């Protein structure tokens, strides 16, 4: 009897745009989206399946989750949020279309007017719990799912918040300062501590490029220590039966703009003598 986001939206990367220009053209990508593979904000209902509705509104990033002056745009959207029927045949609901339309502070006093007008306040906070500090830098999608009571009452499920999604910053200079290791097995799996300048954990990776080769270092968003260090494991090299060491490039890469830091040489090697605690040629 609950809604769980299975595919959080991509946090960094998307630029909140204004109505004057136009509606949009592109929608909020899913967290697992790559520059080639597409995904979208996806949810899943538990303990239930059948008719019903889903409402998706914007809300602040900070605890007192107040409605947000920005207004989701696109299909099934109106007044500022999204609202459509729930396909009864499946329990997983993805949104292939959703756009964050930003409001201009000069008219933010109007946007909020409408918010309470259409009483679009998922967590319904009082008018005194709606201060004037609106972090227009971010926003969080709110999932108001409605269904049927085991009897007849339209059961309104608990509103689930997505990870805040941010706007366009750009521009920072990816710089690798130190690396405790610039050599490892061709079978990959080597842990490496890398010290860098400030980086964002939802928008960073370690790009290992070679001649006609390319892989990424394995690590979690949590392995990004305070924006200035990254602990990850090296990917397997193209040739896993390497007989002679091979130099490869290793760099910081910001996905949202394809930006790359200066390359640092990295030398793959075979497991030869270590793969069996030395034996051959006694």
């Amino acid at each position: 009897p609950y809604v769980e986001i299975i595919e959080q939206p991509k946090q960094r990367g998307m630029r909140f745009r204004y109505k004057c220009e136009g509606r949009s053209a592109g929608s909020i990508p899913g967290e697992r989206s790559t520059d080639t593979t597409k995904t979208h904000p996806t949810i899943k209902i538990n303990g239930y399946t059948g008719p019903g509705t889903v409402r998706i509104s914007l809300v602040t990033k900070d605890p007192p989750h107040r409605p947000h002056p920005h207004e989701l745009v696109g299909k099934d959207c109106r007044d500022g949020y999204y609202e459509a029927d729930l396909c009864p045949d499946r329990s997983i609901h993805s949104f292939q279309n959703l756009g964050i339309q930003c409001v201009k502070k000069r008219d933010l006093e109007q946007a909020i007017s409408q918010r309470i007008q259409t009483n679009n306040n998922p967590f319904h906070v009082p008018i005194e719990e709606q201060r004037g500090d609106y972090d227009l830098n971010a926003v969080r999608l709110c999932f108001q799912v409605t269904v049927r009571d085991p009897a007849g009452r339209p059961l309104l499920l608990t509103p689930v918040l997505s990870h805040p999604i941010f706007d366009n910053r750009a521009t920072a200079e990816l710089k690798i300062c130190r690396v405790n290791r610039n050599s490892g097995s061709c079978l990959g799996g080597d842990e490496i501590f890398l010290l860098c300048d400030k980086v964002q954990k939802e928008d960073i990776e370690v790009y290992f490029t070679g001649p006609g080769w390319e892989a990424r270092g394995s690590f979690s968003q949590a392995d990004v220590h305070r924006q200035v260090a990254i602990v990850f494991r090296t990917p397997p090299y193209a040739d896993p039966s390497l007989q002679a060491p091979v130099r490869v490039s290793m760099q910081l890469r910001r996905p949202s703009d394809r930006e790359l830091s200066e390359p640092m040489e990295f030398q793959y090697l075979p497991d030869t003598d270590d793969r069996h605690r030395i034996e051959e040629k006694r």
């Binding site: 769980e4 299975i6 595919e7 697992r32 990033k61 990870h163 805040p164 954990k201 939802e202 394995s218 690590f219 979690s220 968003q221 949590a222 392995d223 220590h225 305070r226 602990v231 494991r233 069996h276 605690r277 030395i278 034996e279 006694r282």
Partner: protein
């Protein structure tokens, strides 16, 4: 290689040759790699030679240049036979004993077997008394943190039925689930989300120029 009257015999698959039966204190030292004959038994993958523990081979450190005990070697190589033989050796029931022993990386036999996804070795170990929730010193990760990092779903469901505490954190205060963010496996963030404490699920959000988990 300060070989003994057995390494050569050992490396070279031999009968009584590679198994001189005697039956200054009869013993077997180790090479420049700190490998005792028994380590070679495992590395070489010849249980029988190991089967013949005979004089209680190195009962204290019995380690290598990386800090592994023979059983450690058996667990990262994945030889079920050796884990089987090297387990009857009546010493592990002692204190500090192998099932709790760690190499110079603070890795347990359980850790090494989890790292290489040997689901069967992990099962036998926990069965024999290994702490499924034992932590490794670098970051305090349990084998469940490693299964998530290794993105092994088969491994994580197996640590779950072995008693792995879905909660329990790292020196950075992260539950295994908090390590799923930014990774691929939806299957992993599904079999853990449910189990994990409500406030051990999300990641810190740029707090006071630092953002610690707190623990």
């Amino acid at each position: 290689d300060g070989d003994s009257f057995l390494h050569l015999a050992i490396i070279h698959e031999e009968k009584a040759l590679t198994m001189e039966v005697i039956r200054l204190a009869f013993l077997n030292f180790q090479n420049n790699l700190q490998q005792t004959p028994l380590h070679l038994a495992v590395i070489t993958n010849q249980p029988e030679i190991a089967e013949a523990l005979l004089g209680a081979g190195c009962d204290p450190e019995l380690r290598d240049f990386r800090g592994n005990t023979p059983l450690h070697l058996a667990c990262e190589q994945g030889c079920l036979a050796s884990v089987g033989v090297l387990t009857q050796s009546c010493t592990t029931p002692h204190l500090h004993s192998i099932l709790k022993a760690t190499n110079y990386n603070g890795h347990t036999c359980l850790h090494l077997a989890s790292i290489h996804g040997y689901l069967g070795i992990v099962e036998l170990l926990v069965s024999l008394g290994a702490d499924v929730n034992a932590q490794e010193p670098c970051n305090g990760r349990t084998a469940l943190h490693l299964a998530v990092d290794l993105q092994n779903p088969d491994l994580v469901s197996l640590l779950l039925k072995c008693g792995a505490d879905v909660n329990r954190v790292t020196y950075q205060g992260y539950s295994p689930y908090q390590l799923t963010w930014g990774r691929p496996s939806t299957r992993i963030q599904q079999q853990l989300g449910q189990l994990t404490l409500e406030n051990l699920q999300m990641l810190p959000e740029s707090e006071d120029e630092e953002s610690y988990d707190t623990e």
